[PDB]
Amino acid sequence: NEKILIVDDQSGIRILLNEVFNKEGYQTFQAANGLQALDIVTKERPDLVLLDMKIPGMDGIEILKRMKVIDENIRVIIMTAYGELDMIQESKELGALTHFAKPFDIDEIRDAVKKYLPL
Amino acid sequence: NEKILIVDDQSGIRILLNEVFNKEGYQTFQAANGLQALDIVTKERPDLVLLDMKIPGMDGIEILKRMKVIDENIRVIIMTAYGELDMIQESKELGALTHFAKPFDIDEIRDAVKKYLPL
Ligand SMILES: [Ca+2]
Ligand SMILES: [Ca+2]
């Protein structure tokens, strides 16, 4: 029943993550930019978002703020590129659950969402 | 002491894999195409190669044949895109150790190389 939206500009990684959580029984969706994402959040209203903050043109902080407006029950976990202080701080402020840096420990990501979005 | 060369056209995934094996104590190298790879094999003579068979322009079977010519002690594990019969067959013939399809189980890949290239 749980839905997870994976936002990432890179097919390879995005597709790998998707599988990790499909394999877990989660209804997963995928987005490559903040526009698509915003769209899916609107349409599907996922429980959690795995949001890549490094997307060209993309202001991840802004999309994070919008998701919430759209759906205030959505929880987000941001993916940093080797964690950046100010983004991590604004996100905590925005309500993000945690942050994971890439390259990631898939197992740790896994463990993390299961804990945050128990099936 | 063990060296592993990761050949993959996609930075994201390639970089993630690299980390998995760096984290394991392996001296890792990276390539985005068969040319670079061939070069590194020549230069570094790695113990194992994780070879993405789906690289544009790239005949993975041919690069596999060349690696071996260059370095007959090199072992290869091919990454298929949802495993293809004839490629898997020629590779077995060429001496590949096994094949993994993407999206992969990183843990299983991990377990696999450790077993094939024990540290
Ligand atoms: Ca990105
Ligand atoms: Ca590829």
Swiss-Prot record, chains A, B:
Show where the Response regulatory domain sits: 3-117
Which keywords does this chain's UniProt record carry? Cytoplasm, Kinase, Magnesium, Metal-binding, Phosphoprotein, Sporulation, Transferase, Two-component regulatory system
**Which co-factors does it depend on?**
Mg(2+)
Localization of this protein: Cytoplasm
The entry's comment on post-translational modification says: Phosphorylated by KinA and KinB. Dephosphorylated by RapA and RapB.
Q: Which PROSITE patterns match?
A: RESPONSE_REGULATORY (PS50110)
Q: Name one GO biological process term.
A: phosphorelay signal transduction system
| GO CC annotation | cytoplasm
Decide whether keyword Transferase is in the record: yes
Q: What GO molecular function annotations does the UniProt record carry, in alphabetical order?
A: kinase activity; metal ion binding
| List of residues binding Mg(2+) | D8, D9, D52, K54
Looking at the keywords, is Plastid present? no
Q: Which residues carry this modification: 4-aspartylphosphate?
A: D52
Q: How is the cofactor bound?
A: Binds 1 Mg(2+) ion per subunit.
Might you give the EC number(s) for this enzyme? 2.7.-.-
Q: What class of enzyme is it?
A: transferase
Q: Per the annotation, which location comes first and is thus the protein's main one? A: cytoplasm
The entry's function note states:
Key element in the phosphorelay regulating sporulation initiation. Phosphorylation of spo0B during sporulation initiation.
> By what name is this protein known?
Sporulation initiation phosphotransferase F
Q: Which organism encodes this protein?
A: Bacillus subtilis (strain 168)
Traced from the root, the source organism's taxonomic lineage reads: Bacteria, Bacillati, Bacillota, Bacilli, Bacillales
